[PDB]
Amino acid sequence: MVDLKRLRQEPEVFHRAIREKGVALDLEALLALDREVQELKKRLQEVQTERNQVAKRVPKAPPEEKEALIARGKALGEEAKRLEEALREKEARLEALLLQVPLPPWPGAPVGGEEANREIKRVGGPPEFSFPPLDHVALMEKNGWWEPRISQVSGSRSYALKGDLALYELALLRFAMDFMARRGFLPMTLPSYAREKAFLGTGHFPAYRDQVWAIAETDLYLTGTAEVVLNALHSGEILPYEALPLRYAGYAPAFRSEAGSFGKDVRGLMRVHQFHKVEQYVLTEASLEASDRAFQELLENAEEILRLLELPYRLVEVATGDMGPGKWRQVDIEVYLPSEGRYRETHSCSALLDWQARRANLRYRDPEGRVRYAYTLNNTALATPRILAMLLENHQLQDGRVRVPQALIPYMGKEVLEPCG
Amino acid sequence: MVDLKRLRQEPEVFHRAIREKGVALDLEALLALDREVQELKKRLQEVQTERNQVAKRVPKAPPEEKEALIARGKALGEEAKRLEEALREKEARLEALLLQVPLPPWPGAPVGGEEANREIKRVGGPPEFSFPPLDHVALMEKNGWWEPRISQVSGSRSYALKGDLALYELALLRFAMDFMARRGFLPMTLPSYAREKAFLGTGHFPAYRDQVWAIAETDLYLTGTAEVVLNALHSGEILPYEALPLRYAGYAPAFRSEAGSFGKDVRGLMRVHQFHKVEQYVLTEASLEASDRAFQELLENAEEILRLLELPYRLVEVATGDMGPGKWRQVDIEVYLPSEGRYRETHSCSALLDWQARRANLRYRDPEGRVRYAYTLNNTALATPRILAMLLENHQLQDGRVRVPQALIPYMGKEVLEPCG
Numbered sequence A, B: 001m002v003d004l005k006r007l008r009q010e011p012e013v014f015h016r017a018i019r020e021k022g023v024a025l026d027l028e029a030l031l032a033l034d035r036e037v038q039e040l041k042k043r044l045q046e047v048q049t050e051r052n053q054v055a056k057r058v059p060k061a062p063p064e065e066k067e068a069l070i071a072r073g074k075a076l077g078e079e080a081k082r083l084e085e086a087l088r089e090k091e092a093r094l095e096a097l098l099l100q101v102p103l104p105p106w107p108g109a110p111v112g113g114e115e116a117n118r119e120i121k122r123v124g125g126p127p128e129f130s131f132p133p134l135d136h137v138a139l140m141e142k143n144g145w146w147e148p149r150i151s152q153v154s155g156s157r158s159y160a161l162k163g164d165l166a167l168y169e170l171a172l173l174r175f176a177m178d179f180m181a182r183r184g185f186l187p188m189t190l191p192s193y194a195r196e197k198a199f200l201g202t203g204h205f206p207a208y209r210d211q212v213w214a215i216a217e218t219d220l221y222l223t224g225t226a227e228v229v230l231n232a233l234h235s236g237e238i239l240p241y242e243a244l245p246l247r248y249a250g251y252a253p254a255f256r257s258e259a260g261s262f263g264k265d266v267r268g269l270m271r272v273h274q275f276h277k278v279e280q281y282v283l284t285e286a287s288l289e290a291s292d293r294a295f296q297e298l299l300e301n302a303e304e305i306l307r308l309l310e311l312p313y314r315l316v317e318v319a320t321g322d323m324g325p326g327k328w329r330q331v332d333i334e335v336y337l338p339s340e341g342r343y344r345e346t347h348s349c350s351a352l353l354d355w356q357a358r359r360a361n362l363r364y365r366d367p368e369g370r371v372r373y374a375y376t377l378n379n380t381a382l383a384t385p386r387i388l389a390m391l392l393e394n395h396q397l398q399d400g401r402v403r404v405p406q407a408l409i410p411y412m413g414k415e416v417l418e419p420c421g
């Protein structure tokens, strides 16, 4: 959500956002429809005043003249029903269109689709294997670490892990959550469903509605990221200045319908329907200097998890057509997957300024007693099972066993993942 | 699913069992529909036999006799068509009826509903406090360990834990997976959605269908327990005798509609729509002595976990009208909750002999090379957040802080949970 007053005063800035982000919206028709609504509310306020005027006259009206006044009263009341009616269906179409207006991207964002994305930094490299390396699925097959029968129970894009890799999945999630807690974020374990309002608040609805699974015969929806719950905890509340920045590390199960991903990562642990994710969410004051200081620590937090995980990664500056309607800036962290000879993303770091605060109604009292929309940001801390694909392949040993990074040894009790047999 | 040969060789026991378990089944009509389907099958075989000969003989039949056989074959033709439509309708009504036939309760189960459940024994004493104990919602409110705002995001029967209590939830789930993997059970991390076929296999469908949330626009349902996935894994395989008993400890988010008396003791951590559960599942050979050894193992395991968690508990033998249509036996383990002055359910141990093996089609090759339906059992290992309600009330200290049991201090990193603020 955008300030309708800057939309009215500077629609060109918003037309470049629509153009460069590829949003299918006609701003001129939005602004025309907005004028029409404001016209109908003037003429409806006028008929509402006129109606009350005639009504006031009726207590003082003698019979030959109060007969006239009810004739006038009923016609005024009838034009008021048409204006109320036409207004209600035009304001509703305006609401819908405003929910599609994108935030302008930052001035250094690459312009174009995914192909304009630009590697910013690379830390670490592909391992040099003395032996022929297996991919994560053959390493799972070989050591008995996943259960392919899950596919007949739950359908495709499903996984079930076994033995030491079942335990490593849980060890990694507790590790992420403990790392976030010693970095000052408040740990929260959360549900994975929410009402519509929370989806609207983050911007997952309307644009990404097809990516969300509804729970049938309820008004609940399964969340694709704990960002949907963490951002709605404070709707309609005015936070005190001194509470800022709010920094939440929330864990929840995540469900994605993966509509449109035809034949895309149908293979192992990369693109499943349900996974676990620890999320980093920051709500801060409305200054770019506080958004940028929070974006930088969100990124360093995820670079640090990856360095402790001993994984090779690169950061990528995300282009305007690929960051999504509400983003000011987005940087993805990608880890090297050997079996694909390429980097695959594990983390997306976004700064959304006040586009979600205006939708979800997040506000605070600033140092001068003024009330403002806060700025929000979020980044992945660690999502399983997809990092297990990069950890297996980069840490495989010649015998097909896998070593666990030094930081995860306290969490596993062992230095090597063992075949389940 | 019961054995139809035993159903009609022993109707008196299934009639007793339909009465003692409060099942709404007219056994007399089921048994009649069964005689009908079986007589239609024999008859359509006798007309198919005779139909075949009439058809073969009419090319060789002399005039007067060619006409008698044509007429008889025509008569057998119409009859066969009528026997086929009746068999198809009758068989479908009979499969829907067989799915509701209950297993006989074991002879020592109290007869009656919930009221007749008997305490077998209680281990451990109720805590003695040097102060007036707070209840677990007060301890959470005082220490800042949960987030009440989650009700606006997600609705009622939601919980969001914060700070040390969020981390204690993850620690309890990891400790129960490690305890189970140390007791010889295979660790698995599982999905929470499955196809219809898996719910019919456990018995959750048709009888408990209202207790299950469905994912709209899909053929999938959220599982109320990992038992639905773990029981459906080996459908259609014939397990080698030597793989037995299969011991699986599976972890998955569990989702429950709870559309069974909303308003039943709900506020706090006791009945929520989404929780986490580690499950003990055993598939063993079709011997009562194998079921009974597995049942005692499953119970000793949850007892040992509650001993490690330093919690007072009692065992309850469940009555025939409270155990559900598929159980042979059911023993609840209940932990003392000081603020209610009573024990509340934490673990539910079931033996279902082959009632689930026949619906899910679970078979093994017995040591004489005969293929048999196996027997299945299951018991909770640890479910959260309900165990946190008893742990906070029982382990509270004078200042409103909660200590950590000696066995969980390694999982927690500290001997006492601290306020978040």
Ligand SMILES: Nc1ncnc2c1ncn2[C@@H]1O[C@H](COS(=O)(=O)NC(=O)[C@@H](N)CO)[C@@H](O)[C@H]1O
Residues within 6 Å of the ligand: A224, A225, A226, A227, A256, A258, A269, A270, A271, A272, A273, A275, A277, A279, A345, A346, A347, A348, A349, A378, A379, A380, A381, A383, A384, A385, A386
């Ligand atoms: N279907 C999927 N299967 C497995 N992991 C996935 C899937 N979709 C997303 N993820 C993981 O979750 C991470 C974040 O997802 S995201 O859409 O890109 N970003 C968000 O949801 C933001 N809240 C940042 O966390 C991805 O980097 C990836 O690691």
Ligand SMILES: Nc1ncnc2c1ncn2[C@@H]1O[C@H](COS(=O)(=O)NC(=O)[C@@H](N)CO)[C@@H](O)[C@H]1O
Residues within 6 Å of the ligand: B224, B225, B226, B227, B256, B258, B269, B270, B271, B272, B273, B274, B275, B277, B279, B345, B346, B347, B348, B349, B378, B379, B380, B381, B383, B384, B385, B386, B387
């Ligand atoms: N809605 C709920 N909220 C919280 N915990 C629940 C809920 N429903 C069930 N439980 C927990 O899960 C445990 C087992 O649930 S059960 O229906 O009795 N039995 C099963 O599911 C069996 N599969 C054994 O686990 C309960 O003992 C309780 O600890």
